[PDB]
Structure formats: C-alpha cells, structure tokens
Design a protein around this nucleic acid. Structure first.
Lengths: 302, 177
DNA sequence: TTTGCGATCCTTATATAGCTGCGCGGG
DNA sequence: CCCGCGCAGCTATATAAGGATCGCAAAA
C-alpha cells in the first residue's frame, strides 16, 4: 500500500528527528505494520494514519523507558492531542499491549536538563545560575514527594516537574531567588510555562507546610508559602520520616477530595413511577403550538 | 456487602414509532422541538416531566436520554410518542428497549490508580496525560467502570439495574484490598 | 500584573442515521 | 480505471467523574 510505505518512511524520519537509539526504529516500524493488518486502521482517515506514526514510536519509547510525552509527539507531528488520544487507545487495545507508564524519573532528568540555568547570560544573571546536579537531585526528591502525597495521580505529569524544578532552584539560594515568580523563571530558563504548573506549585508548598508542622522548631515559626522555601533543604533531608508522621496524624489526601461542598448527591427524590400511568390530553397539549403560534412562526420565516 | 448502593444517573432507551415522519412539520408544530438539519439530521425534543431529551428521526425511530429510572424512561418515551401522534402522525409504541444505564458511587477513600493499573492490567487502562480516571473493562458483568483518585466510581454499559450493582460489588474488594 | 471563578471541552456506555473518507475486492 | 462493500467517524442526545484551558472580571 502507498499509504503504508509513506507511513513506514514517516516512522523512520520521526525516530531520526527524535535522535532515538538505533534499535527503536525497527520496533516502531514493526508496530505500524502490525497495526495496518487490522481493517479498522486500514479504513481510517489520512489524519489518523499520520498520528499512528507517533503512536508506534511512543509505544516503542515507553517499553524502553525513553521519556517521550504525548504532548511533545503532537507538537512535532503538528497533530491534535484528542486525535492522538483516540488513535493511541485504539491501537493499544487492538494489538493487545501492556504499555508501561511514562517513566517520571527519566522525564525529570531530560526535562530538567533543558532548563538553561547552568551558564550566566544577559537574561540569566550570576545569582540565578545553578549547578545541574544539585538541581536534578532536589527536583527528583520534590517529584517523589508530590507522588507520595497524592499530587501526581490523574494529573498531567510535566506541570508537576515544572513546579518541582522551580522550587528546587529557589530553595538552593532562597534569599536571592524568592523575588522570582514561576512565569519569570520559565522565561529565563527558556521553557514554556504549562498552565497547571501554578496549581501544582501551590499544592506542593501546602504539602511542605504540613510536613513543617511535624517538626516542633518549624511548627513554632508559623510558616507560610514564602517563608517555608528556605527550609525545603531541611524538610527533604527527613522527607521519609515527616511523610509517615503526617499520614499517621489526623488528613493527607488527593486535592480533589479536600474539599467537596455537595455532601449529598441523590438530590432527585425517590420515584413511585410505574411507566404505565395514564397520559392526559392536557399534559400533551402543553407541548403543542397553537394555530396562531404556528401562523406567526410561518410568517416570520417567509 | 459494602453497604454502598450505586445511584442510577441516566437511562438511554429506544423505541420505534413504526411510521415515517416529516421533521419540518414536528419542528414547526411542537413547542419543545429543536431542528437544524444542516447541523444534525434529527429533531431534539424535550419534556419537563420526566425531565428527558428525545432524538426523533425521519425513519420513525427515537432515542430517549436523561431519565433516572427504567420506569421514568418508559413514561417519557410514551409522552414523546403521544406528542408525535397529536401532531398528525400514526405513531405506535414498538420495540421499547433500555440500551444503556449509568450508575455512580463513592467508596469514600483515595485510590492509587498507578498501582491498580499494575495489579489489574488485563482490565485496566490508565493514561493520566489523556484522562484522570482509570478505565476498567469488567468482563462479568460486561461493564465499563471509570475509577477516580477520590474513590468516586462511574459504572456504565448496563442493560439492567442488577449489572450496575453486580459490577460495584465485584470492584469494591479490589479497591479496598 | 495576579488571582479566582465559571464555562466548555476531554473520557466511558448506548442507540439513532445520512454523508463521506478510505482501501480492498470484482469487473 | 469505476462500482459495490465494509468499515471509520463527523454532526447530536444524556450523565456521572476530575483535569485542562479558555474567557472574563475583580482585588492586588
């Protein structure tokens, strides 16, 4: 098939653009071929055949823990994420695959290293320059803390890492970096600001404030989302102990649970309808236009 | 048992009025009809009690959505049929069938979806880059469950009320343990 | 600027149905 | 090089769930 040969060529070009190891190309080509054998794929639009290229490369990457995001693939392929979503779910179901989940540890390393904060420039002053290894180590500890304290489950993973990278960077020199906002930080580090990153930051700061309450010398300081930043180093040194202690007392739950105002969901009253009761003429006539309403509507459309 | 009863939220039912219909006539002569043939080929009709929506097709076939009980869905379907009859069409009430039922629950405890997709992978699909819920495809009964981090569960794909209750009693020990 | 709130989209099931994209067979 | 067939999915209806991501407007 001319559309199959074009597809296999696109698969190989995507792997080379992404600078993937040599073994990946073959596996992704084999998945596209396996996919083409099914009539549901053969009958799909040329737009679905374009995103199918990406699905096969993503599955290959997921099996080798290569941290490729679905958003990044869609950006390279100039594709709609919703079109990619339905094609990926269909092909995983069709090939009967157990695709591993995105490897957060590998995504922290890749994404965090793209933050251009390791050398001074007119847009990155000397006080904003940070060590790459100190950054990665603290970002990872903050991503593991977010995962342990229910801030990652059901959410997009990249805004969580953007918020953890910013907090790692600020906490490494608090006196000189607390004036910098999340939006200014992403701009100088030359990274796009993901919309949910602000919510993740605030949730992560609230989790560190709960931990601070477990240490008597930090509890007495009545810390806030700004003053807690200089103690992040101390809190992460004892993250395992402080998390166990925080769950042990009271309350640490997914943010969507704390809190929901509508405590009672069965608002419609219990019914005594049988489906067999008489339907009166007056009950039906209320849904009918009068001859005058009809004439007035007809004249208005003429 | 769990002591938790899933609540029915929606019933999708179908019925054949057994006659061809002129949708332009229904749209012009009813008060509760919405018809944009360029956008969608059916008439969208709404009644206040039971509060539902019906899609009426020129073939005489009809879809009824939004009812909270199988009894309410039948009464609503009969009311749409009676409105169509009064509009001058020889409508009948043939082959009424409940096609889908949606139930909802709260187990009132958080769920580690990332763990559930590993222990029950053969039924689970969890892709947080796409959707926040875990899609659980139960085989017996054949029900799709959307499981959220909050412990809130959505059950769909049922033809009878018992399939919703059976699927929830099956998922509860999986979620608890 | 910076926040908060509300509206509208995503997912699942399910029927209804014409139009149309897409490739595989026959002819 | 067309014709029919069998898929695919576009418009739409409802409903729960939680997240994303807009617009918009108000305190900072």
């Amino acid at each position: 098939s001319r559309s199959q040969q074009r597809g296999l060529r696109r698969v190989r070009d995507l792997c080379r653009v992404l600078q993937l190891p040599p073994t990946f190309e073959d596996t992704a080509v084999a998945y596209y071929q396996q996919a083409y054998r099914h009539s549901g794929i053969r009958a799909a639009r040329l737009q679905k055949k374009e995103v199918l290229v990406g699905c096969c490369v993503l599955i290959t990457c997921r099996q080798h823990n290569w941290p490729l995001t679905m958003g990044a693939i869609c950006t390279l392929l100039y594709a709609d994420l919703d079109v990619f979503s339905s094609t990926y779910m269909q092909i995983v179901k069709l090939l009967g695959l157990d695709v591993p989940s995105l490897c957060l540890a590998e995504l922290v390393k890749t994404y965090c290293s793209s933050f251009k904060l390791f050398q001074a420039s007119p847009s990155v002053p000397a006080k904003y320059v940070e060590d790459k290894e100190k950054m990665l180590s603290r970002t990872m500890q903050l991503v593991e803390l977010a995962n342990e304290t229910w801030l990652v489950t059901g959410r997009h993973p990249l805004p969580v890492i953007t918020a953890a990278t910013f907090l790692a960077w600020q906490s490494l020199q608090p006196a000189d970096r607390l004036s910098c906002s999340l939006a200014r930080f992403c701009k100088l580090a030359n990274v796009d600001l993901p919309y949910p990153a602000s919510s993740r930051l605030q949730e992560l700061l609230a989790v560190l404030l709960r931990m601070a309450e477990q240490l008597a010398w930090l509890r007495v300081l009545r810390l806030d989302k700004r003053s807690v930043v200089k103690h992040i180093g101390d809190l992460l040194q004892h993250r395992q102990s402080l998390v166990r202690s925080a769950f042990r007392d009271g309350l640490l739950l997914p943010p969507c649970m704390l809190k929901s105002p509508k405590r009672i969901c069965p608002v419609p009253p219990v019914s005594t309808v049988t489906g067999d009761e008489n339907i009166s003429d007056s009950e039906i006539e209320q849904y009918l236009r009068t001859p005058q309403e009809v004439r007035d509507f007809q004249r208005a459309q003429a | 048992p769990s002591g938790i009863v899933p609540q029915l939220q929606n019933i999708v039912s179908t019925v054949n009025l057994g006659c061809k219909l002129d949708l332009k006539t229904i749209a012009l002569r009813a008060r509760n009809a919405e018809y944009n043939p360029k956008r969608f080929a059916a008439v969208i009709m709404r009644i206040r009690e039971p509060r539902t929506t019906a899609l009426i097709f020129s073939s005489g076939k009809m879809v009824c959505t939004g009812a909270k009980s199988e009894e309410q869905s039948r009464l609503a379907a009969r009311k749409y049929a009676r409105v169509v009859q009064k509009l001058g069409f020889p409508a009948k009430f043939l082959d009424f069938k409940i096609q889908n039922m949606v139930g909802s629950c709260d187990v009132k405890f958080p769920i580690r979806l990332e763990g559930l997709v590993l222990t029950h992978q053969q039924f689970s699909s969890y892709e947080p880059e796409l959707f926040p819920g875990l899609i659980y495809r139960m085989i017996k009964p054949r029900i799709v469950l959307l499981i959220f981090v909050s412990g809130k569960v959505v059950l769909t794909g049922a033809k009878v009320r018992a399939e919703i209750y059976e699927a929830f009693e099956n998922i509860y020990p999986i979620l608890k343990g």
